[PDB]
Amino acid sequence: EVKTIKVFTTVDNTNLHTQLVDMSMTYGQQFGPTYLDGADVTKIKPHVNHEGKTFFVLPSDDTLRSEAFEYYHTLDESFLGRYMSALNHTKKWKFPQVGGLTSIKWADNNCYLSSVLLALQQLEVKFNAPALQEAYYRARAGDAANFCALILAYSNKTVGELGDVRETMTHLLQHANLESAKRVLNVVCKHCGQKTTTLTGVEAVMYMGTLSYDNLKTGVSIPCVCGRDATQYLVQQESSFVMMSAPPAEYKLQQGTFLCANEYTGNYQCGHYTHITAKETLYRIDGAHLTKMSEYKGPVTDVFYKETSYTTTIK
Amino acid sequence: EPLSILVRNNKGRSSTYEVRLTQTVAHLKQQVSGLEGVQDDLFWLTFEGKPLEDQLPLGEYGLKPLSTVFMNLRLRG
Numbered sequence A: 001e002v003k004t005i006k007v008f009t010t011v012d013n014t015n016l017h018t019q020l021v022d023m024s025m026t027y028g029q030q031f032g033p034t035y036l037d038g039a040d041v042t043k044i045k046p047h048v049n050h051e052g053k054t055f056f057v058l059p060s061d062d063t064l065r066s067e068a069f070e071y072y073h074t075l076d077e078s079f080l081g082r083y084m085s086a087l088n089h090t091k092k093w094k095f096p097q098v099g100g101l102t103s104i105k106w107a108d109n110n111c112y113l114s115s116v117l118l119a120l121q122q123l124e125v126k127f128n129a130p131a132l133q134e135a136y137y138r139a140r141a142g143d144a145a146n147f148c149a150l151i152l153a154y155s156n157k158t159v160g161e162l163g164d165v166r167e168t169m170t171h172l173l174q175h176a177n178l179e180s181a182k183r184v185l186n187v188v189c190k191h192c193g194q195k196t197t198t199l200t201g202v203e204a205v206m207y208m209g210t211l212s213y214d215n216l217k218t219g220v221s222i223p224c225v226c227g228r229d230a231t232q233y234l235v236q237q238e239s240s241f242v243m244m245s246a247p248p249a250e251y252k253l254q255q256g257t258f259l260c261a262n263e264y265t266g267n268y269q270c271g272h273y274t275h276i277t278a279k280e281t282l283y284r285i286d287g288a289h290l291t292k293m294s295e296y297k298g299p300v301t302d303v304f305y306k307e308t309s310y311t312t313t314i315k
Numbered sequence B: 001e002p003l004s005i006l007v008r009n010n011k012g013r014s015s016t017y018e019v020r021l022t023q024t025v026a027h028l029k030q031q032v033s034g035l036e037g038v039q040d041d042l043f044w045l046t047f048e049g050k051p052l053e054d055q056l057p058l059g060e061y062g063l064k065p066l067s068t069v070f071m072n073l074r075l076r077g
């Protein structure tokens, strides 16, 4: 009496698993939450046209679990479910080429996601998670629907939510290949001598305090645990880039002094991001809109700088 | 075994918070939230530049009596 069909189920779109599907039970009763080309089919009973089709399932058992972990580098049970929810909307976005880079046309408050994708395309970074790396390669070719949905899944954000660019970068750089990133900082207090700390990974490339890379190299005033105020300065930096951040203040961007930057108009309840990169002239990329300019002076919150190796001249 | 640490806000002022090094960072954030008026999702804490992940104990970050945690506001763009 039981009548079945043959399908493939997967969690990483590479390892296919052959499955005999009872046509009298829904895909949910047999596999749990199931998707077919993104479309949720958990409540749907098999159709004869589903023969040989590939179905996305969540890692219910042990084989799928390790397979999903090698692909996404996360154990969050709800990750793939949240990835599919964001992907429903991100497939409808438009990714036009702007100034040589893939941008995101305005929709669903994706201006902070637009600044992330733009900044990434100017940095020499790789992703350790194979799902992020494959989706990023497709993103540089104007096919960024998967990459944006993954970014929302790793950041625990949903479509339509306002977002923070630097926070989003922090989540994705955890899955970046920053193993060789090294940063050495000195804390010079006139009472409590000198102090050296070495930072690695994401902490070696990101900094919160000033937008100026030179400020970090000459001296930043930092509180001292003893009670005074000491000066922090960069001793050694080994990475392909650095990211300086600060609360949105008004700042003058000069050509030939930085790689790219993000600016923020508004307050801490609602604002708008636009991206500024440096090619032949200063480019301003506001979603699908491009604007060239000689000078720029506005409310900057993130600034990126190219880097290979820097050693201080101070002692 | 409670001690006291400082949490500095974005205006440059540090309030004292009574904590145990076994309590999680998420526990501390609910105290900073009640004092400064911001709700937890809209800010994040750092100590000597290193961010604090919510569900880890405070003792793993080397917090000393009267250390200064920093409060950073998350933009909404």
Ligand SMILES: [Zn+2]
Pocket (backbone or CB within 6 Å): A189, A190, A191, A192, A224, A225, A226, A227, A228, A230
């Ligand atoms: Zn000192």
